[PDB]
Write a protein that holds these residues in place. Structure first.
Motif, PDB file in Angstrom:
ATOM      1  N   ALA A 126       0.785  -1.083  -0.078  1.00  0.00           N
ATOM      2  CA  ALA A 126       0.197  -0.299   0.293  1.00  0.00           C
ATOM      3  C   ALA A 126       0.608   1.005   0.419  1.00  0.00           C
ATOM      4  N   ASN A 127       1.923   1.427  -0.453  1.00  0.00           N
ATOM      5  CA  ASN A 127       2.916   2.309  -0.727  1.00  0.00           C
ATOM      6  C   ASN A 127       4.042   1.948  -1.489  1.00  0.00           C
ATOM      7  N   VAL A 128       3.568   3.803  -2.499  1.00  0.00           N
ATOM      8  CA  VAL A 128       4.087   4.237  -4.112  1.00  0.00           C
ATOM      9  C   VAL A 128       4.922   5.188  -2.911  1.00  0.00           C
ATOM     10  N   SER A 129       6.168   5.614  -3.192  1.00  0.00           N
ATOM     11  CA  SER A 129       6.876   6.061  -2.969  1.00  0.00           C
ATOM     12  C   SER A 129       7.692   6.628  -4.868  1.00  0.00           C
ATOM     13  N   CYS A 130       7.542   8.040  -4.680  1.00  0.00           N
ATOM     14  CA  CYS A 130       8.133   8.866  -6.138  1.00  0.00           C
ATOM     15  C   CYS A 130       8.998  10.015  -5.789  1.00  0.00           C
TER      16      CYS A 130
ATOM     17  N   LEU B 165      12.326  17.840   0.187  1.00  0.00           N
ATOM     18  CA  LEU B 165      13.867  17.639  -0.032  1.00  0.00           C
ATOM     19  C   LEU B 165      14.755  16.757   1.020  1.00  0.00           C
ATOM     20  N   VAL B 166      15.251  15.605  -0.179  1.00  0.00           N
ATOM     21  CA  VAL B 166      16.098  14.466   0.111  1.00  0.00           C
ATOM     22  C   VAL B 166      17.822  14.448   0.598  1.00  0.00           C
ATOM     23  N   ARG B 167      18.242  14.824  -0.806  1.00  0.00           N
ATOM     24  CA  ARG B 167      19.347  15.422  -1.496  1.00  0.00           C
ATOM     25  C   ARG B 167      19.544  16.313  -2.714  1.00  0.00           C
TER      26      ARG B 167
ATOM     27  N   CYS C  86       8.248  11.589  -2.082  1.00  0.00           N
ATOM     28  CA  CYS C  86       6.631  10.961  -1.527  1.00  0.00           C
ATOM     29  C   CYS C  86       6.405  10.284  -1.610  1.00  0.00           C
ATOM     30  N   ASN C  87       5.323  10.155  -0.294  1.00  0.00           N
ATOM     31  CA  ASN C  87       4.874   8.915   0.045  1.00  0.00           C
ATOM     32  C   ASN C  87       3.786   8.686  -0.170  1.00  0.00           C
ATOM     33  N   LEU C  88       3.230   7.968  -0.845  1.00  0.00           N
ATOM     34  CA  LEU C  88       1.185   7.878  -1.019  1.00  0.00           C
ATOM     35  C   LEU C  88       1.061   6.723  -0.387  1.00  0.00           C
TER      36      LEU C  88
ATOM     37  N   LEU D 228       8.258  -2.338  -8.714  1.00  0.00           N
ATOM     38  CA  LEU D 228       8.377  -2.844  -7.033  1.00  0.00           C
ATOM     39  C   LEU D 228      10.079  -2.427  -7.159  1.00  0.00           C
ATOM     40  N   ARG D 229       9.559  -2.037  -5.707  1.00  0.00           N
ATOM     41  CA  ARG D 229      11.190  -2.324  -4.930  1.00  0.00           C
ATOM     42  C   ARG D 229      10.588  -2.578  -3.306  1.00  0.00           C
ATOM     43  N   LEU D 230      10.536  -3.603  -2.858  1.00  0.00           N
ATOM     44  CA  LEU D 230       9.961  -3.849  -1.625  1.00  0.00           C
ATOM     45  C   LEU D 230      10.754  -3.780  -0.724  1.00  0.00           C
ATOM     46  N   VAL D 231      10.376  -3.629   0.638  1.00  0.00           N
ATOM     47  CA  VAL D 231      10.490  -3.365   1.842  1.00  0.00           C
ATOM     48  C   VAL D 231      12.161  -4.028   2.352  1.00  0.00           C
ATOM     49  N   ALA D 232      13.077  -3.693   2.995  1.00  0.00           N
ATOM     50  CA  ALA D 232      14.328  -3.953   2.909  1.00  0.00           C
ATOM     51  C   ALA D 232      14.042  -4.984   4.093  1.00  0.00           C
TER      52      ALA D 232
ATOM     53  N   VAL E  41      27.046  -8.088   8.016  1.00  0.00           N
ATOM     54  CA  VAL E  41      26.772  -8.922   6.766  1.00  0.00           C
ATOM     55  C   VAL E  41      24.796  -7.364   6.284  1.00  0.00           C
ATOM     56  N   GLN E  42      24.702  -7.421   5.516  1.00  0.00           N
ATOM     57  CA  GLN E  42      23.041  -6.698   4.996  1.00  0.00           C
ATOM     58  C   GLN E  42      22.246  -8.267   3.663  1.00  0.00           C
ATOM     59  N   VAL E  43      21.370  -7.868   3.286  1.00  0.00           N
ATOM     60  CA  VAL E  43      20.934  -8.830   2.927  1.00  0.00           C
ATOM     61  C   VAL E  43      19.486  -7.732   2.167  1.00  0.00           C
TER      62      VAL E  43
ATOM     63  N   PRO F  64      16.314  -1.871  -0.622  1.00  0.00           N
ATOM     64  CA  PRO F  64      17.512  -1.460  -0.155  1.00  0.00           C
ATOM     65  C   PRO F  64      17.930  -2.234   0.623  1.00  0.00           C
ATOM     66  N   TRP F  65      19.272  -2.213   1.011  1.00  0.00           N
ATOM     67  CA  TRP F  65      19.999  -3.570   1.909  1.00  0.00           C
ATOM     68  C   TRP F  65      19.577  -3.616   3.617  1.00  0.00           C
ATOM     69  N   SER F  66      19.751  -4.588   4.245  1.00  0.00           N
ATOM     70  CA  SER F  66      18.976  -4.681   5.320  1.00  0.00           C
ATOM     71  C   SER F  66      19.756  -3.971   6.474  1.00  0.00           C
TER      72      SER F  66
HETATM   73  C1  LIG Z   1       6.669   4.225   2.490  1.00  0.00           C
HETATM   74  O1  LIG Z   1       7.958   4.191   1.751  1.00  0.00           O
HETATM   75  C2  LIG Z   1       9.040   5.329   2.026  1.00  0.00           C
HETATM   76  C3  LIG Z   1       9.801   4.982   1.221  1.00  0.00           C
HETATM   77  O2  LIG Z   1       8.867   3.844   0.295  1.00  0.00           O
HETATM   78  C4  LIG Z   1      10.668   3.013   0.653  1.00  0.00           C
HETATM   79  O3  LIG Z   1      11.751   3.636   0.226  1.00  0.00           O
HETATM   80  C5  LIG Z   1      12.957   3.141   0.061  1.00  0.00           C
HETATM   81  C6  LIG Z   1      14.038   3.289   1.311  1.00  0.00           C
HETATM   82  C7  LIG Z   1      12.316   1.012   1.018  1.00  0.00           C
HETATM   83  O4  LIG Z   1      12.243   0.875   1.978  1.00  0.00           O
HETATM   84  C8  LIG Z   1      11.458   0.459   0.086  1.00  0.00           C
HETATM   85  O5  LIG Z   1      11.370  -0.346   0.047  1.00  0.00           O
HETATM   86  C9  LIG Z   1      10.362   1.527  -0.433  1.00  0.00           C
HETATM   87  O6  LIG Z   1       9.424   1.362  -1.318  1.00  0.00           O
HETATM   88  C10 LIG Z   1       9.454   5.192   3.364  1.00  0.00           C
HETATM   89  O7  LIG Z   1      10.077   5.531   3.796  1.00  0.00           O
HETATM   90  C11 LIG Z   1      11.401   5.891   3.768  1.00  0.00           C
HETATM   91  O8  LIG Z   1      12.042   5.312   5.330  1.00  0.00           O
HETATM   92  C12 LIG Z   1      13.558   4.415   4.839  1.00  0.00           C
HETATM   93  C13 LIG Z   1      13.038   3.104   6.148  1.00  0.00           C
HETATM   94  O9  LIG Z   1      12.769   4.518   7.370  1.00  0.00           O
HETATM   95  C14 LIG Z   1      14.185   6.008   4.593  1.00  0.00           C
HETATM   96  O10 LIG Z   1      15.470   4.929   4.805  1.00  0.00           O
HETATM   97  C15 LIG Z   1      16.156   5.541   6.169  1.00  0.00           C
HETATM   98  O11 LIG Z   1      16.529   6.795   6.444  1.00  0.00           O
HETATM   99  C16 LIG Z   1      17.879   7.031   7.282  1.00  0.00           C
HETATM  100  C17 LIG Z   1      17.148   7.952   7.978  1.00  0.00           C
HETATM  101  O12 LIG Z   1      16.590   9.005   7.964  1.00  0.00           O
HETATM  102  C18 LIG Z   1      16.533  10.340   7.970  1.00  0.00           C
HETATM  103  O13 LIG Z   1      17.040  11.092   6.636  1.00  0.00           O
HETATM  104  C19 LIG Z   1      16.262  10.622   5.677  1.00  0.00           C
HETATM  105  C20 LIG Z   1      17.862  11.936   4.322  1.00  0.00           C
HETATM  106  O14 LIG Z   1      18.465  11.266   4.496  1.00  0.00           O
HETATM  107  C21 LIG Z   1      19.626  11.916   4.161  1.00  0.00           C
HETATM  108  O15 LIG Z   1      20.472  11.634   4.686  1.00  0.00           O
HETATM  109  C22 LIG Z   1      21.109  11.133   4.927  1.00  0.00           C
HETATM  110  C23 LIG Z   1      22.654  10.880   5.266  1.00  0.00           C
HETATM  111  O16 LIG Z   1      21.759  10.688   7.207  1.00  0.00           O
HETATM  112  C24 LIG Z   1      21.567  10.216   3.405  1.00  0.00           C
HETATM  113  O17 LIG Z   1      22.697   8.694   3.541  1.00  0.00           O
HETATM  114  C25 LIG Z   1      20.703  10.391   2.331  1.00  0.00           C
HETATM  115  O18 LIG Z   1      20.927  10.067   1.238  1.00  0.00           O
HETATM  116  C26 LIG Z   1      19.782  10.983   2.182  1.00  0.00           C
HETATM  117  O19 LIG Z   1      20.526  12.442   1.931  1.00  0.00           O
HETATM  118  C27 LIG Z   1      15.405  11.438   5.482  1.00  0.00           C
HETATM  119  O20 LIG Z   1      14.520  11.014   4.200  1.00  0.00           O
HETATM  120  C28 LIG Z   1      13.945  10.641   6.737  1.00  0.00           C
HETATM  121  O21 LIG Z   1      12.953  11.011   6.197  1.00  0.00           O
HETATM  122  C29 LIG Z   1      14.688  10.657   8.160  1.00  0.00           C
HETATM  123  O22 LIG Z   1      14.616  11.805   8.436  1.00  0.00           O
HETATM  124  C30 LIG Z   1      18.386   6.128   7.808  1.00  0.00           C
HETATM  125  O23 LIG Z   1      19.165   6.212   9.044  1.00  0.00           O
HETATM  126  C31 LIG Z   1      18.529   4.596   7.175  1.00  0.00           C
HETATM  127  O24 LIG Z   1      19.845   3.346   6.617  1.00  0.00           O
HETATM  128  C32 LIG Z   1      19.822   2.764   7.558  1.00  0.00           C
HETATM  129  O25 LIG Z   1      18.736   1.419   7.218  1.00  0.00           O
HETATM  130  C33 LIG Z   1      18.709   0.664   6.081  1.00  0.00           C
HETATM  131  C34 LIG Z   1      17.606   0.149   5.618  1.00  0.00           C
HETATM  132  O26 LIG Z   1      16.793   1.264   5.803  1.00  0.00           O
HETATM  133  C35 LIG Z   1      20.659   0.308   6.141  1.00  0.00           C
HETATM  134  O27 LIG Z   1      20.784  -0.233   4.726  1.00  0.00           O
HETATM  135  C36 LIG Z   1      21.622   1.614   6.452  1.00  0.00           C
HETATM  136  O28 LIG Z   1      22.676   0.636   5.757  1.00  0.00           O
HETATM  137  C37 LIG Z   1      21.500   2.139   7.658  1.00  0.00           C
HETATM  138  O29 LIG Z   1      21.542   0.975   8.471  1.00  0.00           O
HETATM  139  C38 LIG Z   1      17.395   4.006   5.746  1.00  0.00           C
HETATM  140  O30 LIG Z   1      18.141   4.544   5.070  1.00  0.00           O
HETATM  141  C39 LIG Z   1      13.798   6.495   3.985  1.00  0.00           C
HETATM  142  O31 LIG Z   1      14.833   8.011   3.734  1.00  0.00           O
HETATM  143  C40 LIG Z   1      11.969   7.050   3.794  1.00  0.00           C
HETATM  144  N1  LIG Z   1      12.521   7.109   2.634  1.00  0.00           N
HETATM  145  C41 LIG Z   1      11.455   8.264   2.345  1.00  0.00           C
HETATM  146  C42 LIG Z   1      11.072   9.236   1.173  1.00  0.00           C
HETATM  147  O32 LIG Z   1      10.154   9.195   3.318  1.00  0.00           O
HETATM  148  C43 LIG Z   1       8.074   5.161   4.391  1.00  0.00           C
HETATM  149  O33 LIG Z   1       8.585   4.995   5.722  1.00  0.00           O
HETATM  150  C44 LIG Z   1       6.618   4.358   4.277  1.00  0.00           C
HETATM  151  N2  LIG Z   1       5.754   4.681   4.874  1.00  0.00           N
HETATM  152  C45 LIG Z   1       4.595   3.554   5.095  1.00  0.00           C
HETATM  153  C46 LIG Z   1       3.523   4.034   5.600  1.00  0.00           C
HETATM  154  O34 LIG Z   1       4.925   2.652   4.887  1.00  0.00           O
END
Ligand SMILES: *[C@@H]1O[C@H](CO[C@@H]2O[C@@H](C)[C@@H](O)[C@@H](O)[C@@H]2O)[C@@H](O[C@@H]2O[C@H](CO)[C@@H](O[C@@H]3O[C@H](CO[C@H]4O[C@H](CO[C@H]5O[C@H](CO)[C@@H](O)[C@H](O)[C@@H]5O)[C@@H](O)[C@H](O)[C@@H]4O)[C@@H](O)[C@H](O[C@H]4O[C@H](CO)[C@@H](O)[C@H](O)[C@@H]4O)[C@@H]3O)[C@H](O)[C@H]2NC(C)=O)[C@H](O)[C@H]1NC(C)=O
Ligand SMILES: *[C@@H]1O[C@H](CO)[C@@H](O[C@@H]2O[C@H](CO)[C@@H](O)[C@H](O)[C@H]2NC(C)=O)[C@H](O)[C@H]1NC(C)=O
Ligand SMILES: *[C@@H]1O[C@H](CO)[C@@H](O)[C@H](O)[C@H]1NC(C)=O
Ligand SMILES: *[C@@H]1O[C@H](CO)[C@@H](O)[C@H](O)[C@H]1NC(C)=O
Lengths: 193, 206, 93
Positions: free
Chosen positions: B16-20, B49-51, B57-59, B102-106, B178-180, B194-196
């Motif tokens: 139920a999540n679409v991210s653009c 803004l993220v980077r 955006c999160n639908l 499709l991009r599943l949850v880590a 280890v990451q999966v 994404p990696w676990s």
């Molecule tokens: C609905 O979906 C959205 C997004 O869709 C999803 O996108 C990706 C991530 C996959 O999960 C897909 O399956 C799915 O379609 C969900 O939001 C995402 O949630 C994840 C996990 O919570 C999150 O990733 C983690 O972000 C952590 C930090 O978050 C804060 O900062 C970011 C901005 O990040 C910037 O800064 C960092 C350095 O600090 C840079 O590295 C980065 O490139 C950016 O420049 C901000 O956007 C957030 O809002 C927070 O404020 C970060 O610490 C995590 O890293 C750790 O975990 C991952 C595994 O997840 C490991 O691989 C790493 O090694 C770390 O151990 C993650 O990266 C995404 O940022 C979120 N994206 C968005 C757009 O919000 C949302 O939760 C879903 N909602 C529902 C209701 O299900």
């Protein structure tokens, strides 16, 4: 009371329907007729190739020419002397398929760390089948089993060079082409080490 | 990658999540509109803004995390609108096929069930995986030495649904990380998850 | 086309199996999703000049609606198996 016929489609090549003739005190030499649940082409057909137990009909064999998996199969056992003594059954053929053991198993070195296992299916399509891989090491420990779905390849990400591994797989006609629950016989084991 | 518009990329978690994400005079607020052809609803979110030159955006399309909000035959029109002096102006408009993006949850809940001087068995649980694609699950893990790089690490493939790996040939009294990640290769049009969260473990000393 | 209906029939089967599990133990969500897929399967059959197969898809869509209100346990299993059997025929061939 007439014996219940038990049918099994083997690798969708031929169907062997059999009944227990020992249930009756005197062998009455029953007759089997079948048809399919399809409109305007519905009428029974006597078994062309009967199976025999002590010169008395033990069962019936139906060739692939007369096999329609996804049309309900209506089999009817009957006593030729007493016609009112008959038994009818409704069978879904795609849930009664037993595949032939997978063959041509091959191990390949995907990397220095991991090796891959690939097998093939004789008659049934690979898309239809569901496989169960079993592998164990030189320790002769219990088999470690896990199911692979619709793709004839299995991965072993980490291997021990000192230990000697064994592999065997078996297939099942479930769940996308049929709902069969019976697993096929085990393949010939393949070893690495 | 989205077909109709060029610079917009959207991903569906199969539930139920679409991210653009939008890759970029520049106005203050921009939104993302999504409307399915089979469904009567119309979902909206604000880009943040993220980077550099990346806005996300999160639908959220459902009430439950495991709710199946979209199907294989669904097609929702994603539109990007930005507020200007006169009001909403349609910046982008595109078609979006959810099960082709499709991009599943880590994977989560990584833990070690057994650890030896040279052996180690690591487990992981999965979430938000649709029944539509659940039998086609695929896993990839990478093992790295502590201090070394993740690009230097060795990536192992589990081309089946296993959710554990038994590691061999490990050096005693050595720390690993280890990451999966997970994917469903029905038509291979989707991308890897994404990696676990990395799991750090050390083998028993010799 | 056949490749498109094969992919859709497999996903429709996953909905039908989940609903059959619910019946024998969110059903509206799986049923609504099932109806949408069978609607598209019927249209794909209509575009390929297979009117009989499209009529089967429309029949299965109505059977699914009747399953939630069918009183006969034996008829519920027959309709569920009939839907699953046809979907497996589209996936196989
Ligand atoms: C609905 O979906 C959205 C997004 O869709 C999803 O996108 C990706 C991530 C996959 O999960 C897909 O399956 C799915 O379609 C969900 O939001 C995402 O949630 C994840 C996990 O919570 C999150 O990733 C983690 O972000 C952590 C930090 O978050 C804060 O900062 C970011 C901005 O990040 C910037 O800064 C960092 C350095 O600090 C840079 O590295 C980065 O490139 C950016 O420049 C901000 O956007 C957030 O809002 C927070 O404020 C970060 O610490 C995590 O890293 C750790 O975990 C991952 C595994 O997840 C490991 O691989 C790493 O090694 C770390 O151990 C993650 O990266 C995404 O940022 C979120 N994206 C968005 C757009 O919000 C949302 O939760 C879903 N909602 C529902 C209701 O299900
Ligand atoms: C690593 O741990 C997993 C998880 O405990 C083991 O998986 C089990 O495998 C057996 C058959 O091999 C099944 O009967 C269990 O149900 C599985 N458990 C789970 C949770 O899936 C796996 O066997 C272990 N690795 C080795 C090499 O033994
Ligand atoms: C065929 O019929 C024989 C005789 O009853 C039976 O033993 C056998 O199991 C059947 N199936 C196959 C695959 O031989
Ligand atoms: C039983 O019926 C079969 C029918 O094919 C026949 O071949 C066989 O001779 C019969 N046996 C006896 C003892 O009449």
């Amino acid at each position: 009371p007439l014996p219940e016929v038990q049918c099994f489609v083997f690798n969708i090549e031929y169907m062997n329907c059999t009944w227990n003739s020992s249930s009756e005190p005197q062998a009455t030499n029953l007759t089997l007729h079948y048809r399919y649940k399809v409109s305007d082409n519905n009428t029974f057909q006597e078994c062309s190739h009967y199976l025999f137990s002590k010169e008395i009909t033990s069962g019936c064999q139906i060739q692939k020419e007369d096999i329609q998996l996804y049309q309900t199969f209506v089999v009817q056992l009957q006593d030729p002397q007493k016609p009112q003594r008959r038994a009818v059954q409704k069978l879904n053929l795609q849930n009664l398929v037993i595949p032939r053991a997978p063959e041509n198993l091959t191990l390949s070195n995907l990397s220095e760390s991991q090796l891959e296992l690939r097998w093939k299916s004789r008659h049934i399509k690979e898309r239809c089948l569901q496989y169960l891989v079993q592998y164990r090491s030189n320790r002769d420990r219990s088999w470690t089993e896990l199911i692979v779905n619709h793709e004839p390849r299995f991965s072993l990400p980490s291997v021990d060079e000192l230990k000697r591994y064994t592999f065997r797989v078996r297939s099942r006609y479930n769940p996308i082409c049929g709902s069969s629950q019976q697993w096929s016989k085990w393949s010939q084991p393949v070893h690495w080490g | 990658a989205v077909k109709n518009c060029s610079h917009l990329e959207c991903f569906y978690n199969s539930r139920a999540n679409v991210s653009c994400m939008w890759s970029h005079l520049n106005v203050t607020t921009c939104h993302v509109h999504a409307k399915s052809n089979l469904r009567h609803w119309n979902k909206t979110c604000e880009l943040t803004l993220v980077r550099q030159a990346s806005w996300a955006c999160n639908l959220i399309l459902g009430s439950f995390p495991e709710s199946q909000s979209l199907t294989s035959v669904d097609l929702l029109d994603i539109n990007v609108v930005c507020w200007e002096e006169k009001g909403w102006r349609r910046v982008k408009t595109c078609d979006f096929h959810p099960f082709d993006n499709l991009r599943l949850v880590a994977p989560h809940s990584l833990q070690v069930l057994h650890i030896d001087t040279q052996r180690c068995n690591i487990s992981w649980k999965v979430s938000q995986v649709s029944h539509y694609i659940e039998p086609y699950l695929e896993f990839e893990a990478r093992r790295r030495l502590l201090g070394h790089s993740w690009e230097d690490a060795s990536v192992l493939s589990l081309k089946q649904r296993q959710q554990w790996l038994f590691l061999e040939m490990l050096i005693p009294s050595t720390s690993y990380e280890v990451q999966v990640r997970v994917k469903a290769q029905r038509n291979n049009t989707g991308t890897w998850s994404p990696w676990s969260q990395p799991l750090t473990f050390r083998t028993r000393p010799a | 086309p056949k490749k498109k209906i094969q992919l859709h029939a497999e996903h429709a089967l996953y909905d039908a199996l989940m609903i059959l599990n619910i019946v024998k133990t969110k059903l509206e969500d799986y049923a609504f999703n099932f109806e949408l897929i069978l609607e598209e399967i019927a249209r794909l059959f209509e575009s390929g000049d297979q009117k009989d197969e499209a009529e089967k898809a429309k029949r299965m869509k109505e059977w699914m609606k009747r399953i939630k209100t069918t009183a006969s346990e034996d008829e519920q299993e027959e309709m569920a198996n009939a839907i699953i059997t046809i979907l497996q025929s589209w996936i196989f061939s």
